[PDB]
Structures are given as structure tokens and as C-alpha cells.
Amino acid sequence: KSKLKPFFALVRRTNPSYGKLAFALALSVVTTLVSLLIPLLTKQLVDGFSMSNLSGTQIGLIALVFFVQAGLSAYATYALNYNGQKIISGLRELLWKKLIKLPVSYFDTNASGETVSRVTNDTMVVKELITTHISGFITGIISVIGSLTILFIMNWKLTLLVLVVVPLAALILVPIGRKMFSISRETQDETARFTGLLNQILPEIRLVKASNAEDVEYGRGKMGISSLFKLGVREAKVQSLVGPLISLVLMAALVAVIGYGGMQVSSGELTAGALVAFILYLFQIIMPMGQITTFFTQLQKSIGATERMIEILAEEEEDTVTGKQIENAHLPIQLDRVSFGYKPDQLILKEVSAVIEAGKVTAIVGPSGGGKTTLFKLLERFYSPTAGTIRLGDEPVDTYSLESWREHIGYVSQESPLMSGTIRENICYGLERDVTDAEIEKAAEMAYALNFIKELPNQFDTEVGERGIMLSGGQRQRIAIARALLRNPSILMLDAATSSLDSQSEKSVQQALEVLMEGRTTIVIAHRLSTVVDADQLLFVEKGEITGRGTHHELMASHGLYRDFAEQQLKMNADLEN
Amino acid sequence: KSKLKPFFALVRRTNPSYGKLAFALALSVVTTLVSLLIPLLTKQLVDGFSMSNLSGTQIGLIALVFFVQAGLSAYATYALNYNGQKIISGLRELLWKKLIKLPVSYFDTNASGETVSRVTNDTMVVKELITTHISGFITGIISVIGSLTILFIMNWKLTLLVLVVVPLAALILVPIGRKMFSISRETQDETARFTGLLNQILPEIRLVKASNAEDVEYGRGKMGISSLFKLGVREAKVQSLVGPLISLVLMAALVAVIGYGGMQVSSGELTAGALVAFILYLFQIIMPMGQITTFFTQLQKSIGATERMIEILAEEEEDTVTGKQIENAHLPIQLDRVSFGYKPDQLILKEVSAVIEAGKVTAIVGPSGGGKTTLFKLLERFYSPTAGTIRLGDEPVDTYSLESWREHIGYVSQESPLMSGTIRENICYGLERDVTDAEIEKAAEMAYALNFIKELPNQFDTEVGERGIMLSGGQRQRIAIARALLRNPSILMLDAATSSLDSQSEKSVQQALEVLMEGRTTIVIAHRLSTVVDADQLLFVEKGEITGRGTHHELMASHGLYRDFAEQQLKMNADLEN
Numbered sequence A, B: 001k002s003k004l005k006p007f008f009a010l011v012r013r014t015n016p017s018y019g020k021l022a023f024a025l026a027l028s029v030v031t032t033l034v035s036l037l038i039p040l041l042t043k044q045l046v047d048g049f050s051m052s053n054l055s056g057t058q059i060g061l062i063a064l065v066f067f068v069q070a071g072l073s074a075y076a077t078y079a080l081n082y083n084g085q086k087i088i089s090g091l092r093e094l095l096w097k098k099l100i101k102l103p104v105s106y107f108d109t110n111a112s113g114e115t116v117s118r119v120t121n122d123t124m125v126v127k128e129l130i131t132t133h134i135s136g137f138i139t140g141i142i143s144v145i146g147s148l149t150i151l152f153i154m155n156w157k158l159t160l161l162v163l164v165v166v167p168l169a170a171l172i173l174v175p176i177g178r179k180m181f182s183i184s185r186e187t188q189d190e191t192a193r194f195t196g197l198l199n200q201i202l203p204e205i206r207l208v209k210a211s212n213a214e215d216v217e218y219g220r221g222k223m224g225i226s227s228l229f230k231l232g233v234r235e236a237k238v239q240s241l242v243g244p245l246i247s248l249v250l251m252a253a254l255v256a257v258i259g260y261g262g263m264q265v266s267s268g269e270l271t272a273g274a275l276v277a278f279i280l281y282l283f284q285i286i287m288p289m290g291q292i293t294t295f296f297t298q299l300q301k302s303i304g305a306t307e308r309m310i311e312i313l314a315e316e317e318e319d320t321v322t323g324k325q326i327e328n329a330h331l332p333i334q335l336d337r338v339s340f341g342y343k344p345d346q347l348i349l350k351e352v353s354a355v356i357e358a359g360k361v362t363a364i365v366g367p368s369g370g371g372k373t374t375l376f377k378l379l380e381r382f383y384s385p386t387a388g389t390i391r392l393g394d395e396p397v398d399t400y401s402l403e404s405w406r407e408h409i410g411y412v413s414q415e416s417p418l419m420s421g422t423i424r425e426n427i428c429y430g431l432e433r434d435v436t437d438a439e440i441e442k443a444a445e446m447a448y449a450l451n452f453i454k455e456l457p458n459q460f461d462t463e464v465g466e467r468g469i470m471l472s473g474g475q476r477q478r479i480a481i482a483r484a485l486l487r488n489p490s491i492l493m494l495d496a497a498t499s500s501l502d503s504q505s506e507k508s509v510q511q512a513l514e515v516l517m518e519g520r521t522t523i524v525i526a527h528r529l530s531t532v533v534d535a536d537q538l539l540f541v542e543k544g545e546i547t548g549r550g551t552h553h554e555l556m557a558s559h560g561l562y563r564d565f566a567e568q569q570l571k572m573n574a575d576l577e578n
């Protein structure tokens, strides 16, 4: 609560803005002083400099130099802008050091398309306030206090009148402040959701063109713009209510300076020139009051923009803490009852319990929707179990720091996602070492990628492009297997890595992986049982429960379901010749 | 060329801005006139209204009402903002009516993750110019011309001097204009590329967390921010060069009004008060000159921002033109010498020629990297062939309008992409009809989806989230097959639709599809030959060439390769029991 406190804390966590802004403020206050000084000099300076010829020759250069001193007020502007930029740049670094550290559950919950716009399109709203309206506020406040002291030395009562009228402006501007806050929050939310929709539509352009939904999607993208337009005009329709109201307040103050002006008109007003000058300076003060009002409305709008970004920085990332660096990684992974559900109500794993042997092939097999890839996401500690935990040699897996547990496990996903860039920026990813270009090569050959990656310009960059769309549906899986094999991992985890590639490449990659990972522990999902018949252990997973565990022969002889699960399989290939 | 012409054309293609802006301009010019009028009245108005009390009682209300007429200058501001918003909103509709109409080749070429920022983060730069600096320019120009006529009626020569000095300001401000243009273009390009990088990183968060590349990716996201910061400070470092230079120009003009002032000081300067007033009004004119300079620099920056968006609107979309609405769709698709390459140099299809029979199953089978999905992208006219064309009943497929050709062909891709939203927003997509709930069902039951879609809260929305990540890798393929089966298509095209689902679901979906699509033409890719043994025709595709075409038995007996391609397959399943 008290939005100003968290906003200024979020700004003050961007430290190096703090230094030169003082110099900026000093230059601005001195420029404001010289602005207040110029007329008081210039009038009697005209009569004083009656001999313009002689005055301009020697002292006239002063009348030039002060002007370029006005030039050195421009510096203050640039100063602000530089410091201004640093603040928003600081903000982006904060968010980009938080977004990629939040646990994956936050990204299953919040769709990450929108948070990207939170990083890119929100802080650009914080730019305008810091860049201009802070200078506006400071010059306005100093000019107002100066004119206040002036009129105070003019009068003892009418200054009290205006200083009481000002609080009325505060209480009449508060509701517009709240409305600006609410409108800015909804507009920033709407721009975030719009960019999310558009980023989720465009990369799927093949689906749009093929389903013939160009028109429906243009409509659903137009209805998103129109909810910006209204939220981009209603806000304007509130800002217009700062123009009259402020003047309206001065109107009352005028009646005030008239009312007491009529009340004091016997003793006061004897120097009616004093009253006239009072009114003149009231005009001169109504200008900077408008400036201060613009700054307060912009502060409320900026808080309304960043009140959603002020909680992405409070989400508790979770990286290396225990530091118990893994030392063996060659132990059998034990699972004691390990139950887990993405949402807390429904359970997808109901007291699973298996023993992944060390240095052998264990195949998690089962019908779709059974909860296998979620079993790996448990086994790689993306999430954490709700029931009892995993162990290595009777030690819980929460005793080893995550950085020492993900640098030992090479995990090929069901999608085999690629990122835009080179193929040497996806075959080697995050490897702190310099790959040595004999290593990228042995890894690709162990994934049967060296054949197809030499027909193109090279390993060099067949820029895979966005989501690896410049490669096939089989070549990108081969590249993902290569990325997993490059790290020389102790525990391998293939989530159907031979899914979308043909039979020949399947046999080759199988031979290579079995030649390499002989002494290490491997866990493969086999959607078609022909590829894991030789596995050492099998885990039949159905509905989040491990129904049958054992070798292929004993399980198929003891498990009724899996036999059919194999038999139909056999039938098709047993039908191939006849 | 001549950037102002294309920019104003791009704005004028947003018509309904055009109307109320005239009212806005009239209100602004009248407010500028009353601003120029106020002092000339107010001085002798203090003298004439010395009554103090009698003037305020009856006529004093005028001194109030004109102030709220100042309030009705605020309207003009809101007017601009409203019209301002409409322009940028208009722009977004233009781009969103162009981006989803460009042929897919443009999206293979230009990564779409940057064009999304071109739509969302560029026009927000056009907002500031239209919202404020157009009013600034108009008031400044009118005030400058008024003061020019004033000083002209004061003097016949010194006004010529200042009107000659102004062109010097033009020629000294041109280079800053060009620098602002270049900096704005590079900054907009950099923000686009940054948002592209970030949108291609974040949705792959599992890959980042699992490859342990949190630190490398934070670094590659920080190096993107720093190239905004520099491009966001260098621009500021150019804007600061408008402050002094303009004043510097006035400096010369001062010497000018002094120089001829000394030249004419014999005849002129006899009314030295005239010279003093000339200098005073030169100050009063140096203010609006700064305003006009700000507007010109902002115009150059806005052109620098939109000079990349002014060509996305010139890319020649390609939708329904010939209008020869397809009438039969039950003819055999003939392929004449066809050849196609994504880039013009390398050919991926080298004179392919096949005959997809009408009402039968033709299976395109072949090793990965062979060019099958590109053969479908030819057969669905995403791209167009470079060699001879496709035909239906001896008629080229470029004789039928695309809208009548994509509403007849249901095409399941290799990725089976989903979009965030309901499952009833992906099982039925772009269908103009109301999709009864009995139809969504006889569809999702034909794809073996009715079983898993009832365990969850319902068809309603087990929101599949961004890229369908709230569903499995098999459930989303089943949903994609459902989306293809819902449209009741004459030509079906399954690009490995039974890839990532288990054997039982494979058999069920195969039985359902063979029960439904018996009278229609189907084309399936089979990566594992057990699923298309019963197909009527086979197309062995290797390296973009159709090596063997025929039934399974005759081809396997006549084609040496495919036999091994089958035999090894058999071996694994022939090894399953032993």
C-alpha cells in the first residue's frame, strides 16, 4: 500500500541514476533563478544601457555570454534524459534478471507472451515522467514558492488566502489522480494482452492461412486494438479535466482575493497598485500550478503503469543455494511415493515409486495422457513433488544444489525446441567452455546430424529462424538430440527423441547412443515399443500410476495390457509382409 | 524518396482523423489570438477598470467567463489527443490487415517476432508527435507570423534582417534533422530486434532452465538492452544540440539588428524606443522558434521510426482474385514437372510428377530431409511452384481462387500447432458457421479426443495456453486431427498426424479416419510404414525426387531401398517376441 513508497523503491533499486541528478537539479534551480531575475534587471538595464553602442562593445559581450549560459541550461535537459534513460534501462535489467529466474510454474500460470510486453512496453511509459515532468515539477515548485514569498512580502492576509485555496486544488485533483491510476493500469494490461495475442497468432501463420481464418483473426485482432483506443481516449478525456478545474480553483482564489479584498478594502487597497500587482502575480503563479498538476497526473499514470511490474520483482527465484555439488551421479535414482499435480486439486501422479538403475536403460512406456513427461519434469526438478521426494543413494534430491543437478542431466523434450540463430548456437547452448569444434562434430555424428548439416552452408548458421522453422520436423529433433549429447551427461533423458524421424535415422541414432551411453544412466520414452525391447527395465505408466515394472519379457508375460500394447504393434508389422 | 510525402500518405490512409482536426485547429488559432490579445487589453484595463468594485459586480463576470473560455482551449488539447489516438489506432488496423495477408514466404524470410514489435511499439512513437507537437508547431508558427507582421509595421529593414537570419537556422538545423532520422530508425530497429529475441527466448523457458543457460541468456538479453540505452542516449545527445544552436542563430540576428542598427543609427534609432521594442519582440519571437524547432526534430524522428513500417504496407497480399469457385474437388490431383525451392538457388523438389488419385489413400513416404512437407506446402498453395504447375482434371490449380481451395483441404501439420484459448477455439477455427455441440463432438470422437477431453473441466477450455503447453505432446496432435476432421474436407492431408501418440490411440484414430474418409481423397505421410501398408498408392520421396511410385507390394518387390526401409522395420518388431 502507499503506492509512492514501492514506486520510489523500485526506482532506487537502479542506483547509478542517483549521482548526476543532483548536478542536474542544481543547474535547473539556477536557471530558474536567472529566469526569475531577467525582467528585474532588463527594464532598468534598458534605461541604464542608454548608450547601446558603448554598452555593447565591451560589456555587450556579457549580453551574449549569458545567452550561451542559457545554452548551458540545455545541458540540464540532456542530463535528465541521460539519467532518465538509465533508470528505465536499469528497470529492464531488473526484470530480465527476474523473468528467467522464476520457476517454471509461474510460466505455466501466467502466459509469458504478455510478460514480454510488460518488460518492453511498460518501462517506456516510465520514460516520459522522468524525462520531462520531473524538471517541470521542480521548476514549477520553485517558481511557485518564490512568487509565494514575493506576494507574502506584499501582503500578510491574501497570501494566506491563496495558500488556503491551494489545498482545495489538492482535494479537487485527488479523484482525477485515482482515475488516471486506474486508466493507466487497464491500458497497460490491455497492451500487454494485445501483444500476447499477436505474438501467439503470428508465428503460427501457417495455421492461419490453412484454416482460412484470415478474416476471423483480423477481427479478433481489431477487437484488441479497439480496447486500446477506448482506453487511449478515456484517459485523454480525464486529462482534459485538469485544465478547467485548476483555473476554476484560481477563480475561487480570485473571489477570495476579492472577498477579503472587499473586507480589507478600507485599510488595504489604499495602495491599490499593491492589489493590482497581487492580481498580476496571481496570473504568474497560475502558470506553474498547471505545471505541477501535469506532473502529479503523470506520476499517478506512471504508478498505474508499473503497479503490475512492481510484483514481477517479488516472485522468489530459486537457483543454487545448498551448494552440495553432486559428486558421483552414478547412483540409482530412487523414487519414494512421489505424487505431483500441476494444479493443487487434481493429482497427475498418484504415489509413483520406481528405481531407475545406474548405468542401464529404463524405458517409461505407456498410453498418452498417462503422465510420463511430467514424471521427467519431476525427475529434473523443474517443479517439486507434493508427496515424498526423490533420492540418490538414500539422500533426498533437495540436498543437492540445482546447478550441480542440471549440469549432469541431458534432457531432450517432447517438442525439441530450437531457438533462432546458428546451428552452433543450438547444438552448444549455455556451455561455458569453448566448444572445441571437434566436440561439436563428434556430438553431431553421434546424433546422425553430420550428414544433413554439411549439405547446407555449414554448422555455421542455417539460421534455424523462429522456432526452428527453417529446418524440418525430423532435422530439428536430430539437432536437439545433438544438443543433449554434446554435454556428455551422466543421466540422459530422451522424451521421445526418435518420434518424428524415419526408420533409418532411428536405427543410426539408436546405435550411436547405445555405443556412447553404455556406462551412464539413460531414461527413454518409447511410444512405439520396437525401440526399447532391449531395455533393462520397463515402467508401464497409466493414469499417473506405475501399473507394471520389470524387464520386457517378464512384464509382457505378466502384464495383460502391455501384451496387447505389444501384440497390436506386432500385428501391423506382422501384417507388413502379409 | 521525399520522406514527407509517403509519411503523410500513410497518415491520410487513416481517413476519419481528417474531420474534427479542423475544429481543433480553429479553436487553437483563436486561443492563440486571445493569448496575443490579453496584455494589450489588460494594461489599460487596469487603468480603465480602476472602479475595482463596480467593475467586478456586473462586468466582472466577464473577467470570470473568459477564463473558462480558456477552459475551452483545453478541449482543443483533448480534441488533438482523440484525433491523435485515432491516427495511431488507424495505423495498427492497417498493419494488422496486412501482416496476416502477406504470403508465407515473407514470414520465412523476415522473422515475424520482430514485425509484432513493429506493429505494437512503432506507432506508439507516432503518438507523441501528433498529440502535442502539431499543436506546438501551429501555435508557434502563428505567433511567429504575428510578431513578424508587428515588427514589420515597426521597421522595414530589420524585419528583412531577421527573415534572412531564419533561413540560416533552417540550414543549420538540417543536419540535426538527418541525425534524428537515422537515430530514430536504428532505435526502432533495435527495439524490434530486442522484442524478437525476448519473445523467442521466453516461451522456450524449459529449454533455458534445463540447459542451465540462465546466465548466458541473461547476458544475451543484457547486451540487447545496452544497445537500446546507447541508442536512447545518443538521440538525446543530439536533441540537446537544438537548444544552443537556435539561440546561436538569434545571436547572429542580434548582431544583425545591431549591425544594421549601427548602419541605420543615424536616421533610424532616432526613436530608440522603437529599437528597444524591436529587441523585446525579438525575445518574444525566440520562444516560438524553439517550439517550431522541437516540432521539426520530432517530425524527423517520427519519420525515422515509421520508415520501416511504410513498406510493410507495400507487400502485395494475394487472396481470392480469380473467383473460379471449386465445384467438384473429387478429381485426381495431377502434378506435372514440378520443382520448387525456398531460396531461388537451391532446389528442394527437382521435377516431381505424381498423380494423387481421387478417393484413395496415397502415402508419401521417405527418409527425413527428403522434401515431403514441402510437397504438401506446394499442394496447398502456400507457395507456388517454379516449374510447371498442379492440375485438377487437366486444369491448372492457379485457375481456382485460393479461398475455394483452402476451404476444401484439411491439413494437419508436422507440429500440430495450437493457439491459446479454449479447446472449442482450436477444434473449430475460422468456421463461419455456428459449430453445433453435436458437430464438435462427432468430430472430437472421430479423432479419439472425446475420452481425454471429458476427464478435464470440458471442451470449454482446459485453456491450452501459449503454444498448447497445458496439454501433452499426444493430446495436442489429437486435437489437431480433430480440427482437420471438423471441417468435413474433400482432400485430407495428414503430415504425420500419428507421430507422437501411442499405439492404441493410433489404431483407434486410424479406424475412425478410414471409416469417415472412404469416399474422399486422403494423403498421409507415414514415418513408420506399419500405418500405411494398406494404402492404395505409395510415393517414395528421396532428395526431392520421387524414386518409386506404386502399391506397397509391387514397390517393395521392385524397389531395393524401400524393402530395406521396410525390412529393418520388420526386424525390430520381428525381434519384439524374439
Ligand SMILES: CCNc1cc2oc3c/c(=[NH+]\CC)c(C)cc-3c(-c3ccccc3C(=O)OCC)c2cc1C
Binding pocket: A239, A240, A241, A242, A243, A244, A247, A286, A287, A290, B031, B032, B034, B035, B038, B067, B070, B073, B074, B077
Ligand atoms: C490541462 C489543459 N492544459 C493547459 C491549461 C492551460 O491553462 C492556462 C491558464 C491560464 N490562466 C488563465 C488565463 C493561462 C494564461 C494559460 C493557460 C494555458 C496556456 C499555456 C500556454 C499558452 C497558452 C495557454 C492558453 O490557454 O492561452 C491563454 C493565454 C494552458 C495550456 C494547457 C495545455
Ligand SMILES: CCNc1cc2oc3c/c(=[NH+]\CC)c(C)cc-3c(-c3ccccc3C(=O)OCC)c2cc1C
Binding pocket: A031, A032, A034, A035, A038, A067, A070, A073, A074, A077, B239, B240, B241, B242, B243, B244, B247, B286, B287, B290
Ligand atoms: C533544446 C533545449 N530546449 C530549450 C531551450 C530553451 O531556450 C530558451 C531561450 C531563451 N532566449 C534567450 C534567453 C529563453 C528566454 C528561454 C529558453 C528556454 C526556457 C523555456 C522555459 C523556461 C525557461 C527557459 C530557460 O532556459 O530559462 C531562461 C529564461 C528553453 C527551454 C528549453 C527546454
Ligand SMILES: Nc1ncnc2c1ncn2[C@@H]1O[C@H](COP(=O)(O)OP(=O)(O)OP(=O)(O)O)[C@@H](O)[C@H]1O
Binding pocket: A108, A342, A348, A366, A367, A368, A369, A370, A371, A372, A373, A374, A375, A414, B469, B470, B471, B472, B473, B474, B475, B500, B501, B502
Ligand atoms: N502445464 C502443464 N504441463 C504439462 N502437463 C499438464 C499441464 N497441465 C496439466 N497437464 C496434464 O498433464 C498431462 C500431460 O503430461 P504427460 O506426462 O501425461 O504427457 P505425456 O505422458 O508425455 O503425453 P504422451 O504420453 O501423449 O506423450 C495431461 O493429462 C495434462 O492434462
Ligand SMILES: Nc1ncnc2c1ncn2[C@@H]1O[C@H](COP(=O)(O)OP(=O)(O)OP(=O)(O)O)[C@@H](O)[C@H]1O
Binding pocket: A469, A470, A471, A472, A473, A474, A475, A500, A501, A502, B108, B342, B348, B366, B367, B368, B369, B370, B371, B372, B373, B374, B375, B414
Ligand atoms: N523455410 C523453410 N521451411 C521448410 N523447409 C525449408 C525451409 N528452408 C529450407 N528448407 C528445407 O526444406 C527441407 C525440409 O522440408 P521437408 O519437406 O524435407 O521436411 P520433411 O520431409 O517433412 O522432413 P521429415 O521427412 O523429417 O519430416 C530441409 O531440407 C530444409 O533444408
Ligand SMILES: [Mg+2]
Binding pocket: A472, A473, A474, B369, B373, B414
Ligand atoms: Mg519434416
Ligand SMILES: [Mg+2]
Binding pocket: A369, A373, A414, B472, B473, B474
Ligand atoms: Mg506427452
